[PDB]
Ligand binder design. Structure first.
Ligand SMILES: C[C@H]1CCO[C@@H]1C(=O)Nc1cnns1
Ligand SMILES: C[C@H]1CCO[C@@H]1C(=O)Nc1cnns1
Ligand SMILES: [Cl-]
Ligand SMILES: [Mg+2]
Ligand SMILES: [Mg+2]
Ligand SMILES: [Mg+2]
Ligand SMILES: [Mg+2]
Lengths: 194, 194
């Protein structure tokens, strides 16, 4: 039933644009919507990746490796899965491993890679691949992991035990007052609910 | 260490605006960011999303999801039931109300998250994730009545919780839908648990 009729540019920045979307509703009636898109999407299957990095270490409980960064849109610090945009020509897997190493120091191994999933589909067309990666924390490469953030990138690494993730996130929100990302929180809830 | 200096309006629609944010990077260098905000926020958060756990005896526990055309995406998405919190509504009440409108189910609050970010590199949008159980054996949930608000068109999809990730992959494969990143994240953690 439903489909896009037209997409009219309202305002284009260097990184984000706002569009007026005209579409057909399922009664046969024309309607509009205000849509956000990035200006950076080329032929990638998605804008970005987010990495679920499972740090595995003999005689350690598995940890989820998370990052803490100031996010200007939020006016504050956020706790998130390591993530970044996919470069032109780059694979989601390569972007995930590259971003994980830049943001955390760790060298991971691919486990799985999602289809493109929507970030906030009532608002934007933004999508990511969610890439699950295992980190062998017994490898010497992963012993003293040094973040290599790019220009204007400033990231803190936070590893939390998988078996207590939701309580440990609740403890950081109690004591350091930041925001947890919705995907991180969703993953932690499901670890509890399973 | 980092903080907002100023915000400059770039473009304001009825529902969404685009701002250019000036901020202090942790070197003491001044930097800019293009950020999106909703115009609708009052609230604890812009919105709620509901994790609806449908419990019927002698059946697999299901997660209740919705499929809707999303104009920013140009296609159909599979999502947790969700909407904006009314001015003076609690997150819990917004959850039960949104769940009833989009699915017809009448549910009970299990737990409620703090405000979590949707896409903090792009927007300031936040939600409360609200876990809700639905007693599927109750007469009120026998022939559930979906009450769409104006211009909502929602298909309900219930999927077994114990095979959720495989079921979502199947749907994407067969039906050319986009799964929401929070839904996919929850589904991953169900599999990754122990
Ligand atoms: C918040 C939604 C829920 C349904 O009605 C509202 C709506 O029209 N939002 C729009 C955003 N952009 N253009 S219209
Ligand atoms: C797309 C992001 C992720 C990598 O760095 C990019 C960036 O600087 N974005 C900005 C948005 N507004 N001002 S700068
Ligand atoms: Cl539950
Ligand atoms: Mg990043
Ligand atoms: Mg990066
Ligand atoms: Mg909704
Ligand atoms: Mg609704």
């Amino acid at each position: 039933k439903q489909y896009i009729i037209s997409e009219e540019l309202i305002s284009e920045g260097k990184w984000v644009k706002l569009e007026k979307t005209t579409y057909m509703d399922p009664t046969g009636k024309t309607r509009t919507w205000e849509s956000v898109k990035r200006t950076t999407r080329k032929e990638q299957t998605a804008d970005g990746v987010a990495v679920i990095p499972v740090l595995q270490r003999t005689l350690h409980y598995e940890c989820i490796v998370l990052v803490k960064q100031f996010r200007p849109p939020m006016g504050g610090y956020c706790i998130e899965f390591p993530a970044g945009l996919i470069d032109d020509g780059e694979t989601p897997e390569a972007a995930a491993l590259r971003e994980l190493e830049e943001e955390t120091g760790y060298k991971g191994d691919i486990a799985e890679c999602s289809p493109a999933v929507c970030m906030d589909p009532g608002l934007s067309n933004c999508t990511i691949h969610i890439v699950t990666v295992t980190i062998n924390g017994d490898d010497a490469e992963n012993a003293r992991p040094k973040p290599k953030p790019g220009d204007g990138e400033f990231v803190e690494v936070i590893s939390l035990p998988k078996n207590d993730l939701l309580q440990r996130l609740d403890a950081l929100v109690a004591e350091e007052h930041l925001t947890v990302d919705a995907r991180v929180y969703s993953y932690a809830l499901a670890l509890k609910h399973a």
